Write an enzyme that holds these catalytic residues in place. Sequence first.
Site, PDB file in Angstrom:
ATOM      1  CG  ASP A 138     -16.107  -0.457  16.063  1.00  0.00           C
ATOM      2  OD1 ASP A 138     -15.290  -0.967  15.302  1.00  0.00           O
ATOM      3  OD2 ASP A 138     -17.137   0.097  15.691  1.00  0.00           O
ATOM      4  NE  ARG A 142     -15.255   1.571  11.711  1.00  0.00           N
ATOM      5  CZ  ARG A 142     -14.394   0.565  11.800  1.00  0.00           C
ATOM      6  NH1 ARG A 142     -13.276   0.584  11.090  1.00  0.00           N
ATOM      7  NH2 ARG A 142     -14.649  -0.458  12.597  1.00  0.00           N
ATOM      8  CG  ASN A 143     -15.710   4.051  15.336  1.00  0.00           C
ATOM      9  OD1 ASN A 143     -16.575   4.549  14.622  1.00  0.00           O
ATOM     10  ND2 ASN A 143     -15.627   2.747  15.552  1.00  0.00           N
ATOM     11  CG  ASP A 156     -19.450   3.829  16.722  1.00  0.00           C
ATOM     12  OD1 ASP A 156     -20.136   3.087  17.451  1.00  0.00           O
ATOM     13  OD2 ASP A 156     -19.535   3.803  15.481  1.00  0.00           O
TER      14      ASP A 156
HETATM   15  C1  LIG Z   1     -18.705   7.471  14.103  1.00  0.00           C
HETATM   16  C2  LIG Z   1     -19.895   6.500  14.110  1.00  0.00           C
HETATM   17  S1  LIG Z   1     -21.268   7.259  15.042  1.00  0.00           S
HETATM   18  O1  LIG Z   1     -22.526   6.568  14.805  1.00  0.00           O
HETATM   19  O2  LIG Z   1     -21.107   7.126  16.481  1.00  0.00           O
HETATM   20  N1  LIG Z   1     -21.332   8.882  14.553  1.00  0.00           N
HETATM   21  C3  LIG Z   1     -21.002   9.903  15.233  1.00  0.00           C
HETATM   22  C4  LIG Z   1     -21.145  11.044  14.630  1.00  0.00           C
HETATM   23  C5  LIG Z   1     -21.627  10.726  13.292  1.00  0.00           C
HETATM   24  C6  LIG Z   1     -21.980  11.436  12.139  1.00  0.00           C
HETATM   25  C7  LIG Z   1     -22.435  10.744  11.013  1.00  0.00           C
HETATM   26  C8  LIG Z   1     -22.535   9.315  11.033  1.00  0.00           C
HETATM   27  C9  LIG Z   1     -22.192   8.604  12.196  1.00  0.00           C
HETATM   28  C10 LIG Z   1     -21.734   9.294  13.309  1.00  0.00           C
HETATM   29  O3  LIG Z   1     -22.988   8.640   9.900  1.00  0.00           O
HETATM   30  C11 LIG Z   1     -22.099   7.699   9.357  1.00  0.00           C
HETATM   31  C12 LIG Z   1     -20.666   8.222   9.345  1.00  0.00           C
HETATM   32  C13 LIG Z   1     -20.280   8.926   8.060  1.00  0.00           C
HETATM   33  C14 LIG Z   1     -19.557  10.245   8.320  1.00  0.00           C
HETATM   34  C15 LIG Z   1     -18.452  10.142   9.361  1.00  0.00           C
HETATM   35  C16 LIG Z   1     -18.193  11.491  10.040  1.00  0.00           C
HETATM   36  O4  LIG Z   1     -19.246  12.339   9.661  1.00  0.00           O
HETATM   37  C17 LIG Z   1     -19.224  13.645  10.190  1.00  0.00           C
HETATM   38  C18 LIG Z   1     -19.425  13.865  11.545  1.00  0.00           C
HETATM   39  C19 LIG Z   1     -19.417  15.166  12.063  1.00  0.00           C
HETATM   40  C20 LIG Z   1     -19.207  16.227  11.202  1.00  0.00           C
HETATM   41  C21 LIG Z   1     -19.009  16.008   9.840  1.00  0.00           C
HETATM   42  C22 LIG Z   1     -19.022  14.715   9.336  1.00  0.00           C
HETATM   43  N2  LIG Z   1     -18.813  14.490   7.921  1.00  0.00           N
HETATM   44  C23 LIG Z   1     -18.155  15.545   7.149  1.00  0.00           C
HETATM   45  C24 LIG Z   1     -18.178  15.330   5.642  1.00  0.00           C
HETATM   46  O5  LIG Z   1     -18.289  13.992   5.327  1.00  0.00           O
HETATM   47  C25 LIG Z   1     -19.528  13.518   5.695  1.00  0.00           C
HETATM   48  C26 LIG Z   1     -19.897  13.900   7.125  1.00  0.00           C
HETATM   49  N3  LIG Z   1     -19.619  15.475  13.498  1.00  0.00           N
HETATM   50  C27 LIG Z   1     -20.067  14.536  14.542  1.00  0.00           C
HETATM   51  N4  LIG Z   1     -20.129  14.951  15.799  1.00  0.00           N
HETATM   52  C28 LIG Z   1     -20.519  14.147  16.779  1.00  0.00           C
HETATM   53  C29 LIG Z   1     -20.882  12.843  16.482  1.00  0.00           C
HETATM   54 CL1  LIG Z   1     -21.413  11.755  17.794  1.00  0.00          CL
HETATM   55  C30 LIG Z   1     -20.817  12.436  15.144  1.00  0.00           C
HETATM   56  N5  LIG Z   1     -20.401  13.307  14.243  1.00  0.00           N
END
Ligand SMILES: CCS(=O)(=O)n1cc2c3ccc(cc31)OCCCCCCOc1cc(ccc1N1CCOCC1)Nc1ncc(Cl)c-2n1
Length: 289
Positions: A138, A142-143, A156
């Site tokens: 994947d 985005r990942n 991810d």
């Molecule tokens: C990548 C697929 S995931 O399932 O593996 N995944 C891992 C995340 C994570 C966060 C939200 C999410 C899924 C996530 O919801 C759906 C995705 C929508 C947003 C994508 C990125 O959002 C952020 C992340 C993080 C900080 C800020 C955002 N944005 C900033 C503003 O705009 C909205 C939010 N910092 C993070 N640090 C460790 C993990 Cl481990 C993670 N994020």
Amino acid sequence: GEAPNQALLRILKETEFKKIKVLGSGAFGTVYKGLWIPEGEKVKIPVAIKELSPKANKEILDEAYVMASVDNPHVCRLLGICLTSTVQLIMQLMPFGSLLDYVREHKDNIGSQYLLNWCVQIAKGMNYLEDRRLVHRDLAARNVLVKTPQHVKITDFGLAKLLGKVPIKWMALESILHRIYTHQSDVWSYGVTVWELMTFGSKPYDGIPASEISSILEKGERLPQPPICTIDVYMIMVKCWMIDADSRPKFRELIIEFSKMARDPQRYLVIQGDEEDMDDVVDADEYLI
Ligand SMILES: CCS(=O)(=O)n1cc2c3ccc(cc31)OCCCCCCOc1cc(ccc1N1CCOCC1)Nc1ncc(Cl)c-2n1
């Protein structure tokens, strides 16, 4: 059949961390920004807590297994899991979010150096995964998450599998047609990710139904050359998108090429105007056991 996986899976107490804010939500579940405080260790670690039936637990524990089996500066670090009602995954917080969102937001202030360095770091992470005989399946902008604008990490691993619903527009043709996944299909997805970065987060094959992507690729059609890209970078992407998977570049070669490029960034990318109490906060990359 390989060496025994002696990785440690850490179980964390739910009382040890506080949820702070919602980062994102959807069908996969919800992810919270929060802080983790191990009892009596005088440290606060910014973390992301992934959360959402016994089928969900199985896949979340598969992801936990994969992420506990990896340790690389360019791969998401799993701190541990909290066995609550639904299993939570505790991960290093990436404050700046996804590389896709970051690039879309800051395109007017992103230079060639940063783009080429991101390509180098992503290639390094993927090469490490190949060393571990891990196939991400994947890989996309985005990942890839942004710890700092100078440091990105692949994340991810929900679809990650050992060497032995899908997002079609990032997959290699052999994956679309015969469900074959290989590190070279990861190279194809790496090329698509580089394209995402160079077009400053545009949607690949915008407006095209995914059902005809297979035919489009069979005809020889590929993603166009981004305006900022010199024939060198676009040629690298096209090599990543070749039909013969063995003819595509290896991740270590991509590391070498993009590092060469990053030593003279303006020669290879042409971009207009290029030239409460957190006293005890520790980043996860500096918290080891
Ligand atoms: C990548 C697929 S995931 O399932 O593996 N995944 C891992 C995340 C994570 C966060 C939200 C999410 C899924 C996530 O919801 C759906 C995705 C929508 C947003 C994508 C990125 O959002 C952020 C992340 C993080 C900080 C800020 C955002 N944005 C900033 C503003 O705009 C909205 C939010 N910092 C993070 N640090 C460790 C993990 Cl481990 C993670 N994020």
